[PDB]
Structures are given as C-alpha cells and as structure tokens.
C-alpha cells in the first residue's frame, strides 16, 4: 500500500482548498478515476485531477 | 487564438437554431456559451460544452468536437433573441477568448 | 442569490484612471476567481482580466497588459480593476463575472455576471 | 487510518450529477461521475481492486 501509491494505483482524491488557488477546473480539462469533482452550492462542477504518483501520501499531507 | 463565430443567425418561432463557434483545437477546450439580450448582462447557458445550468430551458444543448463547437436551441421562442458568445480559456497563452457573437433572430 | 455589483465607472479624461470595485454577495467570494470583461458600445464581449480565488494568479489581455491591474479583497468581498492610462477607444460597459469553479488557477468560464458599469472616456 | 476510514474522511475513487472540501464524485459525451462511498471508501476500493 506504500508501493502501490508510488505507482499511483491508489486514486485518493486531492482536497479542494476552497480558499487557496489550486489546479481545479471542469470535467473537460481533466483529460488535459481520472479526476475528482464537486458541485458547490454556488458553482459549477469543479474537478481536480488525482496525482499521478503518491496520491495517498499527498492527500495525507 | 481566434474563435470564429457566425455574425448572425435567423430562425422562425418553432424551428431550431445552431450557433457554431470554431477554433483550431476547440475539442480540447471547455467551451462556455453565454446569452446576452439587448441592454442586459450576459447569462451563462452552457458550461463544460454541455452542462446546462439551473433554470436554463432544457431546449438549450451545447456540443464540442474537433474544430467546432455548436450551441443548439430547439423550438426557439421570440424571447430567445440575443447575442450568444463562445468562451474558452486558451491555456497556450493563458487568456480567455470570446467569440464574435451570433445575433439570433426569431422573426 | 449570487449577485455582483460593479462600481467606479463614469466619464474620465483620455489618460485618466479608474478602479472598478466589484462587490459580490450570495456566494463564497473567497473561493471563486473574478473575471473582468468589457463590451464596446455595440460590439462584442472582450475579456479584460482575471484574478484567482485568492489573488495568486492574475491574467490580463495583451491590449491592457501593463495598464490594467486586477486586485481583490475577500474580507470585504470585493474585486477591483485599476485601469490606468485610459484611452479614447476604452469606453465600454465593464462587467465583473465570478468564475464557476472553486480555487481554479485559470478562469475556464464565468458563472454569475455583474450588472455592468458603463465607463465613458472623452474630453 | 482505519478509524479515519470508517468515518469516510479519505476519498478513494472506486476502480452524472456532481456531488478544504472533500470531493464527492470521481469522473472519467457528458460528465459521468461515480459517487464515493460514504464510509470505508478505501476498504471498498481495495476489496474491488483484488476482485
């Protein structure tokens, strides 16, 4: 489970800060478990891609 | 990043309208469609090339593929007369680009 | 509901300056980036600037780069656009529109538009 | 980490109307998104990954 997320095999969703700029966007821009999306009560589908490696480790930090 | 869009589209009450805005690589971009009636603020009617917001009539349907992205309004009322604007974030130069606007005419 | 109000427009001399405040309400102003668009009196929409959900990334058009400058204050729920060295062809209707995505570095597309403040520039 | 999991406070995409803020869906035409399980997201993902 530590070697798995090194390969990126654990698709743990990155958290959307909601108060600090990130690499979020819409569904279409995800391409350029693919990405994790939210529908805020005052916004469109905000989608942030899972990291290609250390997704679980990056989430835990 | 030029976003070509027809200067005008004329339809009849009951028919359908297709406003087709086209870029070089519009298939790889998030096309948003806004509606702006005369003397009013533009209104988002299509997002993510197809996601219709809340309250927008379900007759409105966007599309995006290849070099062109189209907005189709089916069974247009006389209250659909407005200017419809494409909008994409060109990531190569990091700039938002609007289309030329298509003045819909519903006779 | 979600509603943006622009302020600070009006007639200015050719070469003057303005700061269009944009008070947003009905939404979490801290989580969404604010665009700035202008529409010439009879022409199409023209993107003008964008500022991220906190202010880290700010983008400008090439015709206004080095003259216009976005800014914001999430505590006061406002967004500003300092427009310096305003030219004659700069008269338009300026809208501030919130981006539709939380904490996005790029303004992929507006969600709620402002009312639009009419800026005129003439002797 | 498993108590952190049974509370469903770590979102793992299993392997569509959408929904720091926890993302509530994972997406791959329209935007089709599978919801993330409320509790034991990692456990269910591991159970399906080996099955």
Residue numbers in the entry:
A (entry chain B): 95 to 126, 135 to 163
B (entry chain L): 2 to 108
C (entry chain H): 1 to 123
D (entry chain A): 95 to 109, 119 to 122, 132 to 140, 145 to 167
Any passages from the paper?
Hepatitis B surface antigen (HBsAg), the sole membrane protein on the HBV viral envelope, plays crucial roles in viral attachment to host cells and serves as the target for neutralizing antibodies (NAbs). S-HBsAg is a transmembrane protein with a cytosolic loop (CYL) and an extracellular hydrophilic antigenic loop (AGL) or the “a”-determinant, which contains the B cell epitope recognized by the host adaptive humoral immunity. HBsAg dimer is the basic building block of the viral envelope. Cryo-electron microscopy (Cryo-EM) structures of HBsAg dimers in complex with NAb Fab fragments reveal that the antigenic loop (AGL) of these distinct HBsAg types share a common structural core comprised of four β-strands.
Notably, during model building, we observed connecting densities between two adjacent disulfide bonds (between the C139–C149 bonds of each protomer), suggesting a degree of heterogeneity in disulfide linkages. The disulfide linkages in AGLType B are dramatically different from those in AGLType A. The structure of HBsAgType B in complex with FabH006 shows that FabH006 binds to the top of AGLType B on one side, primarily interacting with one subunit of HBsAg. The H2-β1 loop on AGL is bound by CDRL1, CDRH2, and CDRH3 of FabH006. The β1-β2 loop binds to CDRH1 and CDRH3 of FabH006.
